Amino acid sequence: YRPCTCTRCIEEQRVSAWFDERFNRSMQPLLTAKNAHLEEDTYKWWLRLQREKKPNNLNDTIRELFQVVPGNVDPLLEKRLVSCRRCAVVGNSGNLKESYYGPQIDSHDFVLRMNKAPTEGFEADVGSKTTHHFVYPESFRELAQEVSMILVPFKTTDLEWVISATTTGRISHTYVPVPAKIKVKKEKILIYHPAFIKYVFDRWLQGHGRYPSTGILSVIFSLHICDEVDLYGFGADSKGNWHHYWEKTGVHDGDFESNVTTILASINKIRIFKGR
Ligand SMILES: [Cl-]
């Protein structure tokens, strides 16, 4: 832990007891060979998200995964080498349209994006820069060469997919078709820690919903990796519409998720850019 040199620091204690109760400095948001053993209850919970009939042994899968992708990444992505890390987290809302936020977005040290969201042809609004990009097998698009891919695994097969799609191309389906092959270089792949998913669900969502959305997973990841966090493209537009910029059930609690980001903004732990 080090205090940052930004105007404010996310880690700063005693600003908000609500914040101090939830934020856990000892959490590691990325999987490594050294941190990969899940406690029993964590592992059971994670298996219940999508309930694969009979998953391959997790230890086996992870051993194989780290023969492919790097197994000794710094879990905070070398935050300790800088004194202020400024991050933009850019969601998929149509509220980005005609917002003109691109240049401010690209002014950040890291820019974090998710799902199939394009920047090409939208740069004036969403920026041209990406440092990190959150995907899963059923929500992937090819990424520029300089972009770190963060796989968010919601079942054991998602880990097997990363191995397959960078090697043999044998996995072409989960419950829907998925890319058999991807072009991302192995050394640019990061794996969101399943225990970090549960931390977000338990501490930050307080168990609202079946499991956390990519949106809220990206935000809480950024609170740990960054010193300063600006959100873009979260929520509805000014007309109340939920449409993506480029084009309910109980599984996620979008209302509660949006309430978390709202509270975070109210305590200056993030700034929210609402767009149009
Ligand atoms: Cl551990």
Curated annotation (Swiss-Prot):
Disulfide topology: 4-9, 6-84, 87-226
Positions bearing carbohydrate: 24, 59, 259
Keyword check for Glycosyltransferase: yes
BP term (GO), one: protein glycosylation
Tissue-specificity statement: The long isoform is abundant in salivary gland, liver, lung, and colon mucosa. Both long and short forms are detected in submaxillary salivary glands.
Annotated GO MF terms: beta-D-galactosyl-(1->3)-N-acetyl-beta-D-galactosaminide alpha-2,3- sialyltransferase; beta-galactoside (CMP) alpha-2,3-sialyltransferase activity
Membrane disposition: Single-pass type II membrane protein
Assigned GO CC terms: extracellular region; Golgi medial cisterna membrane; Golgi trans cisterna membrane; membrane; trans-Golgi network membrane
Protein function: A beta-galactoside alpha2->3 sialyltransferase involved in terminal sialylation of glycoproteins and glycolipids. Catalyzes the transfer of sialic acid (N-acetyl-neuraminic acid; Neu5Ac) from the nucleotide sugar donor CMP-Neu5Ac onto acceptor Galbeta-(1->3)-GalNAc-terminated glycoconjugates through an alpha2-3 linkage. Adds sialic acid to the core 1 O-glycan, Galbeta-(1->3)-GalNAc-O-Ser/Thr, which is a major structure of mucin-type O-glycans.
Protein name according to UniProt: CMP-N-acetylneuraminate-beta-galactosamide-alpha-2,3-sialyltransferase 1
Organism this protein belongs to: Sus scrofa
Source taxonomy: Eukaryota, Metazoa, Chordata, Craniata, Vertebrata
Covered residues, full protein: 59 to 343 of 343
